[PDB]
């Protein structure tokens, strides 16, 4: 019975097929759009930080991988709409489990999870990513965070989405 | 006598012992005269750590025991939480269908890992690679649906973490179409192979009486011809609505268990096709806002996060919506005091969950009767008297996942 | 008469400061003078103990790149006639590993100055 | 090793670079998977990826032939002695990759049963986040370790590098003292 | 019959197969260590 | 007893163990009671199973052995009196009409506020022949944590009696060897007891650290 | 061909290669014999394994594949069996045997060494011993002019051998087994 040798056909045939390996790192494979990559702190179109420092993301984290401290948005130095912003925001990626409960928790969409995943270091401390590393890059039309809200607008306008560069 | 007997640690660090299983074997020559199991090298205190996290956080914990059956752990947990809540009848039909589909794809994935690691332990080097190719297709589907390749927390008390993405259904159809063809490759390597049969057939014999005495379940039990499956007996998640045959064999040996797993993959493919047919648009979370997970994840240029519509509703328009979001996210639902036992048919047998709530927002006591833990009691029966090589095959047939064993 | 030489290993400079503060130039006037060799990296500690000439080693179990218990096990498996090892444990449940490290004594964090001094005296006596 | 007795200069520099290139390739992992991260190592070896492309296909079953100990899993208390024994029974040079949050820092399991980081028992060369880290993240960490190995010194250079790293590490303040912007 | 016989005791500093497991009363479990081995460790 | 089994008494609204973040809400006293005995007409096959159990066991023995019957969420839990556990287990396993051949394990749970009944062992039994499920609940005091080991009746209870002894200290007397299975034999304490601390460490952060969740506030 | 097949099986056994691979048996003995070996000592064990593979492949080429003689597609070329081309042909055939080695490793699981010994003594040794007698009788007959008897005996012997080996592989290794009786523990009702 040639059936007992069927395996030899499988391996031999697969010899002549193009290998299915993804070419990471030179040609990295496509991650799912919904993949739970690095957390990211997002900004409003005018550049203000979305994070209001409510600590809900930290509240919901099962691994205590987020440390957040809020501070007042004083008129001289405002970073987010409303009266609170996240002054200190750290994610201990050696405790993060990528569960995504933080982004589900966030009430402002300030915290998202990008598809970026490359992360590693030889030092434990270097993987405690602070606010500086997590903040999204400043895009076109955005100003420095320490600036007053958009003219003729208020927190409710930001949350309703009625703000533009 | 003693002079002719060695005692050797098959040990945690050993290719066939999944790194954290310690088979202490007393061998006369190379025949396993006696067997013992050092367990707990992978203990994690998950059961105790659950007690300090709310519900819907314990999902992330339970999914990380029996990590090869994440969706089964999550489904058992969520079925228990809902049963304590008394909302098992309120789960949306779409949520139940998705739970069944995911558990069946997960059964295919877990059986693929079992066959891969067993073949590699038995020298079938290409078996691991082909099994992991099929598993990688399944994991692409899982990643698209849940955003994670493993330890998903996608199934939540009262439904699912989020609805399927638009492309998930097409990917699952593509699986239902290609997966049997790919599994044909792995089956060809092993099913009828003379060496494979010689290596597994008649190895690790365990009669039905032994399975009952040790409380064995899953493929090991059903290799004795008993068609016991919790999906048919004591149905859950609406398994009663699916036409599938309980795979069983009468060999009672390693090859019978292997064939049972192979055939269960095909049965799971059939069940997933049925799920696709039954799948209808609708909610994936209970309508009861007092319990429903308030988050609404959506994608954008920024990434994955709470949908702007939900953000607007809770920060701009609804005070009650904001309160509900805040509370259900932060401390979570509080489950009425009670004590429940809920069982599912994980790929390795009856995955049972004894769960106790003291009326608080955290589970008072969660215990998993992981099938691997009980199945490992069959190693003494299935290894004693055979050679060490036969012991490898028997242990692989038990297909333990030490995460579920130790927990 | 010889100044007892003590190796203090910890990635955290504050743990080294606390150890060097609970212990002083003399643990007691009846004891010889004490000299401290601070080491922040496990390779350096291993090299120092390879050179010998140490009467006690205080290894921080909480050391980041290489915990103190691992270093204790390594030194007792690698240096012949190595000095007694005192391990600082970051939690009560680490006590078991402190035993596994075979460290002659274990002192939990936060370092109680008197407990550390008493343990050091017991090890040197 | 006579390679260490070699005097500095172009000879020792060339020996160092050749050894680094050789050791970054053929970096055989130890067959030592734990918990769920082990499934991700196996996937990394699986066809979709290919650990073999980096010369790392041979998962040395015995610690003797293993060069890299990818802990890759959560280390329970009872397992720490076993893990240390395996690490010791590997032979120089040795490297440890703490794959996953559990291996690196105990991850989500901050309790009695878990060791709270592999580094508590063996020197860790690279920390790799993730729970589990997807295979691309594992390959990224492995390539970072390759870069680290390539620059690894030898002999008198090794001694000088150890002394310099000591001098640098003695000064860094602890993480608890980085109070930047804290209220 | 004692299912799989009890595993040998795992103590800090001692985890060989020779080591006997500890019963709740603190006594060494005879079944924990194979009879062929000399009771020790 | 006949009243529902109070396992904990929580004082104050909002499920707060401490004194209260807001004044004036701490005066509520609500005992957390696990369900008491069910009225006799048990639903489904539970009524038949108990009728058969009371037929096989003598009326006197049935009264002595079955402390309570709780039908909660369409699940039957027989609060069996300690000491009598082996007898009722044998009856359930061997009797043709009961025939609970498959004992699924033994789960320990701790009720530090449940005086005289702090430790509970749960035996999920399944009868494949009749396709039935029940649970047995056996209570032992924290001061006398002994329970009859079902090893003779259900060998599978081995490694479950051992695990529950390891994590709760329940001494299943008569067990062939009740040694620790998960924890090292040298371990001190029984981790899953409520009094046993979680044993975590603070999570480090630049300039701060988050204590383990057991030390921090909770509103269970 | 029978001698060639027996020799092929036996050399795959000799080189400790899959599907035999018994002395190493990574999945059963961690590293087998070369456990406790590191550096160039382990390297030399592997080097010896591969040099033995090359030696047995070359010996198979010598005895059965005409050694270095050019194969049929090139045999028609003038000078193919002359100069340095024979080196190319010998290398090609040796590497076909190496390909067979790698193919077996990729495809087949590893046997239990008792099963390998059963194969060797119940199949290989008997088959080769019978084949020697068959070949001797056939050659003697044709040398004495009884060619028809020689051909008939050869065909009948090979047919009988392939039938009996099939019987051993399927009849002696029966694909049937008995049932089992109950015991102390109560058992469910089987289907
Ligand atoms: C000496 C000298 C200087 C001479 C001069 C000339 C000169 C320089 C050279 C001469 C020639 C020489 C000597 C060359 C040197 C090289 C040499 C001799 C040979 C070595 C190279 C070699 C033998 C290569 C080929 C070997 C080969 C094909 C290797 C591939 C093996 C494979 C496929 C490995 C993959 C296995 C794999 C997927 C491993 C993962 C398993 C791990 C780590 C996880 C553990 C684990 C497992 C295993 C579970 O089962 C499991 C199941 C369920 C849950 C969890 C787990 C779990 O945790
Ligand atoms: S990221 Fe979101 S949840 Fe976290 S503090 Fe900022 S606004 Fe609140
Ligand atoms: S992914 Fe999960 S564990 Fe990680 S920071 Fe976000 S919420 Fe916390
Ligand atoms: S890091 Fe995550 S996936 Fe890896 S062992 Fe820990 S819990 Fe499992």
Swiss-Prot record, chain A:
Keywords: 4Fe-4S, Cell membrane, Iron, Iron-sulfur, Membrane, Metal-binding, NAD, Quinone, Repeat, Translocase
Subcellular location field: Cell membrane
Catalysed reactions, semicolon-separated: a quinone + NADH + 5 H(+)(in) = a quinol + NAD(+) + 4 H(+)(out)
Cofactor needs: [4Fe-4S] cluster
Cofactor note (record): Binds 2 [4Fe-4S] clusters per subunit.
Alphabetized SUPFAM superfamilies for the sequence: 4Fe-4S ferredoxins
Bilayer disposition of the protein: Peripheral membrane protein
Domain spans labelled 4Fe-4S ferredoxin-type: 41-71, 87-116
Residues binding [4Fe-4S] cluster 2, per UniProt: 61, 96, 99, 102
UniProt cross-references to InterPro entries, sorted A to Z: 4Fe4S_Fe-S-bd, 4Fe4S_Fe_S_CS, NADH_quinone_OxRdtase_chainI
Binding site for [4Fe-4S] cluster 1: 51, 54, 57, 106
E.C. no: 7.1.1.-
Pfam family, one: Fer4_7
GO terms under cellular component: plasma membrane
MF terms in GO: 4 iron, 4 sulfur cluster binding; iron ion binding; NADH:ubiquinone reductase (non-electrogenic) activity; quinone binding
GO biological process assignments: aerobic respiration
Record family assignment: Belongs to the complex I 23 kDa subunit family.
Subunit text: NDH-1 is composed of 14 different subunits. Subunits NuoA, H, J, K, L, M, N constitute the membrane sector of the complex.
HAMAP family hit by this protein: NDH1_NuoI
The protein's name: NADH-quinone oxidoreductase subunit I
Organism: Mycolicibacterium smegmatis (strain ATCC 700084 / mc(2)155) (Mycobacterium smegmatis)
Lineage per the UniProt record: Bacteria, Bacillati, Actinomycetota, Actinomycetes, Mycobacteriales
Swiss-Prot record, chain B:
UniProt keyword terms in alphabetical order: Cell membrane, Membrane, NAD, Quinone, Translocase, Transport
Molecular-function GO terms, alphabetical: NAD binding; NADH:ubiquinone reductase (non-electrogenic) activity; quinone binding
Superkingdom assignment: Bacteria
Main localization (coarse): membrane
Membrane topology: Peripheral membrane protein
InterPro entries: NADH_Q_OxRdtase_suD, NADH_UbQ_OxRdtase_49kDa_CS, NDH1_su_D/H, NiFe-Hase_large
HAMAP family referenced in this protein's UniProt entry, alphabetically: NDH1_NuoD (MF_01358)
Name of the protein in its database record: NADH-quinone oxidoreductase subunit D
UniProtKB/Swiss-Prot annotation, chain D:
Transmembrane segments: none
Localization in the cell: Cell membrane
InterPro entries (UniProt xref): NADH_UbQ_OxRdtase-like_20kDa, NADH_UQ_OxRdtase_20Kd_su
GO cellular component, one term: plasma membrane
PROSITE patterns named in the record: COMPLEX1_20K
Cofactor(s) annotated in UniProt: [4Fe-4S] cluster
Predominant location category: membrane
Keyword 4Fe-4S: yes
Gene3D superfamilies referenced in this protein's UniProt entry, alphabetically: 3.40.50.12280
HAMAP family noted in UniProt: NDH1_NuoB
Protein name: NADH-quinone oxidoreductase subunit B
Species of provenance: Mycolicibacterium smegmatis (strain ATCC 700084 / mc(2)155)
From Swiss-Prot, chain G:
Top-level taxon in the UniProt lineage: Bacteria
Transmembrane regions: 1-14, 57-77, 84-104, 117-137, 149-169
Compartments reported by the entry: Cell membrane
Biased composition (Pro residues): 178-191
Biological role: NDH-1 shuttles electrons from NADH, via FMN and iron-sulfur (Fe-S) centers, to quinones in the respiratory chain. The immediate electron acceptor for the enzyme in this species is believed to be menaquinone. Couples the redox reaction to proton translocation (for every two electrons transferred, four hydrogen ions are translocated across the cytoplasmic membrane), and thus conserves the redox energy in a proton gradient. This subunit may bind ubiquinone.
Family, as annotated: Belongs to the complex I subunit 1 family.
Subunit structure: NDH-1 is composed of 14 different subunits. Subunits NuoA, H, J, K, L, M, N constitute the membrane sector of the complex.
Protein name, per record: NADH-quinone oxidoreductase subunit H
Organism: Mycolicibacterium smegmatis (strain ATCC 700084 / mc(2)155)
Gene it is expressed from: nuoH
Residues included from the entire protein: 205 to 395 of 408
